Amino acid sequence: NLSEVVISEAIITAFMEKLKSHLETDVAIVGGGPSGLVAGYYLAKKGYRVAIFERRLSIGGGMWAGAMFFNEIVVQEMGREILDEFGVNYREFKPGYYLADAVEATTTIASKAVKAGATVFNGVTAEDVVLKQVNGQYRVCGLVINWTTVELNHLMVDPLVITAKYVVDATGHDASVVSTLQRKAGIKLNTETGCVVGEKPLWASVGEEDTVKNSKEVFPGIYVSGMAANATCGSHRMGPVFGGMLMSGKKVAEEIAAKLN
Amino acid sequence: NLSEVVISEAIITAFMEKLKSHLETDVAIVGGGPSGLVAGYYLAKKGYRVAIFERRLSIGGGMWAGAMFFNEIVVQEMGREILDEFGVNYREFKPGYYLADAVEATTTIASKAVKAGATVFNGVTAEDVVLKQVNGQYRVCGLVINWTTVELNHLMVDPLVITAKYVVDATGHDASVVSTLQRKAGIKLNTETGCVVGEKPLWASVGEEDTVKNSKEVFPGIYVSGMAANATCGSHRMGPVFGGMLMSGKKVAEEIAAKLNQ
Amino acid sequence: QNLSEVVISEAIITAFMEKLKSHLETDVAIVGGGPSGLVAGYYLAKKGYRVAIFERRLSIGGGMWAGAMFFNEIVVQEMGREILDEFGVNYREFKPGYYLADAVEATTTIASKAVKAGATVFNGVTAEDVVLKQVNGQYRVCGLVINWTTVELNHLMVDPLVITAKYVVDATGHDASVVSTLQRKAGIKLNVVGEKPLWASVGEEDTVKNSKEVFPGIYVSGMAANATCGSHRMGPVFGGMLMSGKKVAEEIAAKLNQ
Amino acid sequence: NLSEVVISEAIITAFMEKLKSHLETDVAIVGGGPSGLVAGYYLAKKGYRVAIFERRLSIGGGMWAGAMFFNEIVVQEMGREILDEFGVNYREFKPGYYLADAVEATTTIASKAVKAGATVFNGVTAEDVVLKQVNGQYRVCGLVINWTTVELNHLMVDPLVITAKYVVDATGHDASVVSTLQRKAGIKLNTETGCVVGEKPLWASVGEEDTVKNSKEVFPGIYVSGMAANATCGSHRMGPVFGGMLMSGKKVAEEIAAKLNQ
Amino acid sequence: NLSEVVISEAIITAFMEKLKSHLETDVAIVGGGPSGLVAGYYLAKKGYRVAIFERRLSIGGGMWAGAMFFNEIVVQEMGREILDEFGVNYREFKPGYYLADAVEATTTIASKAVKAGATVFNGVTAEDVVLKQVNGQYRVCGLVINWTTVELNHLMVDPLVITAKYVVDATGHDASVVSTLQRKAGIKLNTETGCVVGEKPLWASVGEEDTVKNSKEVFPGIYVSGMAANATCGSHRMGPVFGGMLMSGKKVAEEIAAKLN
Amino acid sequence: NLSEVVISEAIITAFMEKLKSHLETDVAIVGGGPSGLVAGYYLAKKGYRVAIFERRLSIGGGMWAGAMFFNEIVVQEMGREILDEFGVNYREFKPGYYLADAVEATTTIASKAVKAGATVFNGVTAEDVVLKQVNGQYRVCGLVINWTTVELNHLMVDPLVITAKYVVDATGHDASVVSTLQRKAGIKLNTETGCVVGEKPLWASVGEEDTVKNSKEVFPGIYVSGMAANATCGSHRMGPVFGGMLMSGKKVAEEIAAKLNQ
Ligand SMILES: C/C(=N\CC(=O)O)C(=O)[C@H](O)COP(=O)(O)OP(=O)(O)OC[C@H]1O[C@@H](n2cnc3c(N)ncnc32)[C@H](O)[C@@H]1O
Ligand SMILES: C/C(=N\CC(=O)O)C(=O)[C@H](O)COP(=O)(O)OP(=O)(O)OC[C@H]1O[C@@H](n2cnc3c(N)ncnc32)[C@H](O)[C@@H]1O
Ligand SMILES: C/C(=N\CC(=O)O)C(=O)[C@H](O)COP(=O)(O)OP(=O)(O)OC[C@H]1O[C@@H](n2cnc3c(N)ncnc32)[C@H](O)[C@@H]1O
Ligand SMILES: C/C(=N\CC(=O)O)C(=O)[C@H](O)COP(=O)(O)OP(=O)(O)OC[C@H]1O[C@@H](n2cnc3c(N)ncnc32)[C@H](O)[C@@H]1O
Ligand SMILES: C/C(=N\CC(=O)O)C(=O)[C@H](O)COP(=O)(O)OP(=O)(O)OC[C@H]1O[C@@H](n2cnc3c(N)ncnc32)[C@H](O)[C@@H]1O
Ligand SMILES: C/C(=N\CC(=O)O)C(=O)[C@H](O)COP(=O)(O)OP(=O)(O)OC[C@H]1O[C@@H](n2cnc3c(N)ncnc32)[C@H](O)[C@@H]1O
Numbered sequence A, E: 001n002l003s004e005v006v007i008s009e010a011i012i013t014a015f016m017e018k019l020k021s022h023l024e025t026d027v028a029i030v031g032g033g034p035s036g037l038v039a040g041y042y043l044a045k046k047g048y049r050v051a052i053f054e055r056r057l058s059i060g061g062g063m064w065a066g067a068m069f070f071n072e073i074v075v076q077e078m079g080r081e082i083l084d085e086f087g088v089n090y091r092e093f094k095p096g097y098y099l100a101d102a103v104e105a106t107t108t109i110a111s112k113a114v115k116a117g118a119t120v121f122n123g124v125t126a127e128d129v130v131l132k133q134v135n136g137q138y139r140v141c142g143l144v145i146n147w148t149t150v151e152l153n154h155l156m157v158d159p160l161v162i163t164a165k166y167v168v169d170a171t172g173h174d175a176s177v178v179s180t181l182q183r184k185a186g187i188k189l190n191t192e193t194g195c196v197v198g199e200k201p202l203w204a205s206v207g208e209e210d211t212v213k214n215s216k217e218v219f220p221g222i223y224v225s226g227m228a229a230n231a232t233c234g235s236h237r238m239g240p241v242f243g244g245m246l247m248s249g250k251k252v253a254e255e256i257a258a259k260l261n
Numbered sequence B, D, F: 001n002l003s004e005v006v007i008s009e010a011i012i013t014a015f016m017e018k019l020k021s022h023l024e025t026d027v028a029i030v031g032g033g034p035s036g037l038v039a040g041y042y043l044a045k046k047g048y049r050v051a052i053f054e055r056r057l058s059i060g061g062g063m064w065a066g067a068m069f070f071n072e073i074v075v076q077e078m079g080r081e082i083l084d085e086f087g088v089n090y091r092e093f094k095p096g097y098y099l100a101d102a103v104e105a106t107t108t109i110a111s112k113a114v115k116a117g118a119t120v121f122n123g124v125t126a127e128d129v130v131l132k133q134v135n136g137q138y139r140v141c142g143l144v145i146n147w148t149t150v151e152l153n154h155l156m157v158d159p160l161v162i163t164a165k166y167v168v169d170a171t172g173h174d175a176s177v178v179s180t181l182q183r184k185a186g187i188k189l190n191t192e193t194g195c196v197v198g199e200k201p202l203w204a205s206v207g208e209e210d211t212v213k214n215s216k217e218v219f220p221g222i223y224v225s226g227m228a229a230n231a232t233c234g235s236h237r238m239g240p241v242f243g244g245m246l247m248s249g250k251k252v253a254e255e256i257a258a259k260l261n262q
Numbered sequence C: 001q002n003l004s005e006v007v008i009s010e011a012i013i014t015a016f017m018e019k020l021k022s023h024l025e026t027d028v029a030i031v032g033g034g035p036s037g038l039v040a041g042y043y044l045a046k047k048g049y050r051v052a053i054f055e056r057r058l059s060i061g062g063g064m065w066a067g068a069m070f071f072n073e074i075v076v077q078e079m080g081r082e083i084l085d086e087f088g089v090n091y092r093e094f095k096p097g098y099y100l101a102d103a104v105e106a107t108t109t110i111a112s113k114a115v116k117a118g119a120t121v122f123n124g125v126t127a128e129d130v131v132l133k134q135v136n137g138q139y140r141v142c143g144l145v146i147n148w149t150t151v152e153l154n155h156l157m158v159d160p161l162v163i164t165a166k167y168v169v170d171a172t173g174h175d176a177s178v179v180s181t182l183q184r185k186a187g188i189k190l191n192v193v194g195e196k197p198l199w200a201s202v203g204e205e206d207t208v209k210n211s212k213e214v215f216p217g218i219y220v221s222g223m224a225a226n227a228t229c230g231s232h233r234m235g236p237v238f239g240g241m242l243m244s245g246k247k248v249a250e251e252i253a254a255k256l257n258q
């Protein structure tokens, strides 16, 4: 009736066509938090080929838990309009403050992002970042990837190499991909200074306005996004308001779409 | 421009409301894996007040990773119609076998269940049931819940309690809730031995057949579905095919739905 | 200032030694400074018995600090309400029969009166075993085998010291650590079945009924009593925790007047 | 008779209102040791609204254990008068040296501080400050809080934010709050340098001297008390003598109470 | 000059043809210790299709370290003739006692086994064992496999299913595959009793003679081998003499080859 | 039939002999990865007394798992001839690119190196060098070795010492031996900074080119090869292509071989 082997063969064949397929993508996003997912949504909407490389088996990052396990997220008016196209239900709590359910937003955003074409590879840690000289200087043009698993158990397993036109570090507070660039290649970042400055303490107002503005190309071929943008640029954090996180992924997507012409 | 205080007010206030309004529910489901989520969808879609208590911050259980991190999940025709009530796109590989992306399927089923009214509490462990004499019967009457971090770190933190009319143990392989029921209370389960028998080795054809059959009331007030059904009744596991797990959830919600219109 | 480091060290050492040596023989040795153990030690010391409490944590209070799920509130019903009044714990009637208390104020106030009342606390100290001596023709618990908690955690080859008591109180909570041990290592029999799932009404009746001398010389109090007399727990209602501690203290004080 | 869902809802309701009514506070104390509790008592005595955020499930910091598990604390004359304001029994060892039972000192100070209105939240780590440019000046205006377990287990759970007119670092040797303030802001503190200098070795005379003197506003909006003050300003540690910790706490409360009438 | 992607594509394509290939093997050996490797050698020599599933990234099991890190192994006369076809150098220490270098024997055995055709999948834990009814009763006819990694980090990752005509539990002291059969299916083993009896304390003489004799089909479709044979049958261990381990893998191979007709 | 005593005698006696006869060697190689093994082969094949000290019980380094547990290793034409001195079978995938099974290649290279006379000590950490003044020069003169379990468990166990005429740091990415050389002794290495520079991000064409170039003497008496060469000199890593690593080992053995016929 039901062959164990057709099933293994099917799982094996599909994943590995899928991974051969994305050995070249236009945009490789690192981190499947909100900003990573929203960026990959819009880029997959505009038709580009988008891979998302997520350290944990699940996507969603720090949105699942809300604040202190109280799984309600807040967005202001900027980002409320992003809860709209993904279709996230929200009611108004006070003028300019829109509550949503943390689980609903995360799964709906993530479902629409993968349905738009963005491939997800979960369990995969972006380890380092391919940089070569292409007509002139050093340019980031790919990712070094391994199983998260391998990383933390400290196993001598060699990585695989994904190549891309643009990398988005949507990796959260730790900004680990641009940190790793910065540290291993010795370069300078477009941050003034030329380093991962480290995120400043909390101020919701300045914090979110800066997240949108910090979402830029800090080195040729690599964009920060979401909370890595505030870590890289040395701006304030904003607590559990997620409007700036969603907005950031949209900004990095349309801007990368702009250069992709 | 923004009051950090207002964001904090709104989160504390909202979650407080969500928790209070589910201290008494029709159906408390334990575990947001494939089968637990589908049961919550259909139970909500039929208009019942449902809460889901999930140990990890992210729902989806063993289904994120397809098999061996190879992001694909196979279903056969049985769960292939379940994949259409949710809008999970798929292709077939060979006749009768279907492939969906594991992440799309997990998040899509997840989204539509919580949109139907399934209220998800993540980072919450169900650690015991409420066991209480009804008309001359011990009956599972609800759950004893704590934060997962309290169990993990062995912190002396007392749990809270919710009441439900039915509890669904959908905790996977662990069969976690019924296992606790049997040892702390010395009751018997509707199984060959009276106990959680434990799953047998792999046989995909019998395993998927026995999952919908074992998804049943095993003691007054509590169902098992999913891998927990096979683990409780002593049937074969099936491997990375998810048609049983999805069908399991629909079957249990319909049976509990019927029982609720007595 | 003129603070001799030598004098501060000598004081701390001299005082603790003499406190420690003066409780090598106590009337009642209580294991566990959670709610029942502290309340039992208050009521016994207020009656003028030498009570020693042995708490594995550096802090007392056990599981009362967190209320439920870190939500710092204690709910007490009829019985525990009037014990709160014995200790001076403020409260507030949510609905008739239910009284809310600050979980931190209850713990620290109960702890404070218990130790002011004469009950001596030894924190950081794990009761590891009991002393079984034959007395009057039967085996009987006659005190404790104690070590540093930190020797148990890091698995260190360090011997215990021995406390002598007329009665021992296992107020260890869900673990029923002392009677489980006695039972496991002697091949005795008690009156440890393990607790049952939650039924808070039988749970708070069953905690006071079950706080009894389950083997010569050793009472069980509080949650330890329910786990031993395999009954139902109760959740974040603390009334029977407070009442059983007073109950055990009355029983023990009565048997000690003979 | 005993309805567990009435119990559950009273706890969920009181606590989450206790938390909302301290999203706004006059003074947020981080650290429920002897210094942080004493400042909390004297501020609450004077009627100001006070929250104390405590990392462990219990308060008491390092006073529980005396020195080397020997449960005795030594105070001199300056601690001696503070023990009498609390009703802590003591005995005189050699002239000008008083020893109290360390369990009695910790639980009594704690009890009276909380009876006077100091609200305490356990299992809650202050992990960062709110920094706001107030009239052209960067000022500490609150705390970023999370559950302790979330930091231990490295969970991706966002914080809640409270707001305060004054923050007291009373985190003992670690000087946790002012330490993260400096490295993440890059600011400078009222010392010779910035950040925390780190404590010197031991010299009880100078160590106790300097605790009283270093309990200061080291940056607008945040004070340091107790050993965080010695650590921040780089003075000597005193041994297991707690006179300076208690007096440190009382100084910071009277100083902050002054500034709260301006 | 040198494309990062042809390299990833090559590693991806080859492994996954290789794993599609062995979704059916004649014999799936669990454990790449000496007995597992010697069995797969001879079965691959006789032309059968042999997969080896090894929990650790390296093969060799407990042979690498010799005894107490003193990396010299001993074989008696039985097994000396097995050091011959693999070509392991050995000098005679005393009549009937042949020393070999632990690293040399392990790598040479393992190289000749993989060169004979035995495929190795390392990092792969055999988790459970497919049993179905095939004309009559329950028969072991495959393996449930996952990444070792997954197992120990306790990650909810589903396994894959390999199907085979015969399974060899060459898994060492722990006999984990037949233990897992025995415990999950409730069956009885051909051991008298019907359980993993557990290995007896040490006696070199009886221990090694029993290893050869205990290497049998303890349940339809599954063979023990090497040190799992002594664990399953309740016989003595033999210390760091490895002659019986090598002999056992040969016996299980020619006997399984016999039934494969 | 058998004397357990005789087996134990023969193991203790044999290993004792093997250890003693290598307390003084021509070349002590640290690390039995791809590049370390190939260098030991060619150095033995040319008749020099070689010892290899490998931290783990199994040689082979990062090469067992090909890439991401996908058991295949790519080499280009450069290491494609190296694969023939050992008899590692391969196919080509696209022109100039070759695939060998990672397990066959690892064990085959390993077998032939130890058969050529390379004596392998596994479970042994090189933790320091011997540094000793020769004709008016500090020169690496040998190694300080301990059991890996002593380092892992932080046991107070003193090491032993071997002497060699050349030490080859082939410890992969860690560049473990030269890193210790630089910090404990304050020497400089033949590199841009004088220090272990650290590897740069990935560039497979330059990475493999720079590996044979950086496989050189970096301080009197010690070479680097393999990934340690790239890590010490600050070049690009290359990913899962092993032609540099094999060529690296042959180059270093030839250079050390020449230097040894001064
Ligand atoms: C608003 C806020 N903080 C404000 C405040 O604290 O005041 C938050 O914390 C938000 O969650 C931040 O949103 P954002 O999308 O920027 O990040 P996230 O949710 O933390 O997602 C990051 C993702 O990136 C993953 N990740 C990490 N590092 C790697 C790696 N090398 N390779 C692959 N993935 C990696 C990681 O698993 C995670 O899922
Ligand atoms: C097909 C298959 N196996 C076949 C095979 O192996 O051969 C699978 O693994 C499927 O994923 C099984 O799906 P199913 O929905 O039955 O279970 P799951 O995916 O493992 O999810 C169960 C959920 O329950 C959670 N959970 C556990 N215990 C508790 C607890 N006390 N309280 C709250 N939640 C808990 C747990 O985190 C998990 O998320
Ligand atoms: C009502 C309720 N639960 C209902 C429910 O969950 O459904 C509770 O949990 C209450 O907090 C229980 O109150 P109770 O006083 O019975 O127990 P507790 O708070 O856990 O205190 C036990 C004390 O005993 C300590 N302890 C443990 N074992 C030893 C040992 N061998 N030696 C010395 N001390 C030990 C331990 O650290 C602790 O302080
Ligand atoms: C006299 C002496 N030392 C002298 C010497 O060693 O020679 C002492 O140890 C005294 O006990 C010092 O008393 P003091 O009140 O200054 O500090 P403490 O007892 O150590 O308590 C600080 C409290 O602060 C808590 N805490 C820490 N960090 C955080 C954080 N980020 N957030 C929330 N709470 C936190 C922490 O759990 C602790 O309870
Ligand atoms: C002679 C002796 N002892 C005598 C004495 O002590 O007196 C020995 O220890 C010999 O090494 C035994 O040789 P043998 O080939 O029988 O076993 P081994 O060397 O221990 O190899 C077992 C292999 O099996 C592996 N393994 C384990 N369990 C699993 C699993 N579920 N799935 C996949 N692989 C697994 C494991 O990694 C290992 O490599
Ligand atoms: C191609 C590639 N990377 C490219 C990329 O990532 O992009 C690789 O990983 C290759 O495997 C590198 O081969 P190479 O022979 O250079 O190094 P390796 O395989 O990692 O082996 C080094 C050996 O050295 C061992 N070792 C470490 N440190 C010590 C120590 N102090 N003492 C004794 N041995 C030690 C260690 O166990 C290991 O076995």
Ligand SMILES: [Fe+3]
Pocket: A157, A158, A159, F062, F227
């Ligand atoms: Fe590498």
Ligand SMILES: [Fe+3]
Pocket: B157, B158, B159, C063, C174, C223
């Ligand atoms: Fe409890």
Ligand SMILES: [Fe+3]
Pocket: C158, C159, C160
């Ligand atoms: Fe002893």
Ligand SMILES: [Fe+3]
Pocket: A062, A173, A227, D157, D158, D159
């Ligand atoms: Fe955050």
Ligand SMILES: [Fe+3]
Pocket: B062, B227, E157, E158, E159
């Ligand atoms: Fe499963």
Ligand SMILES: [Fe+3]
Pocket: F157, F158, F159
């Ligand atoms: Fe030394």
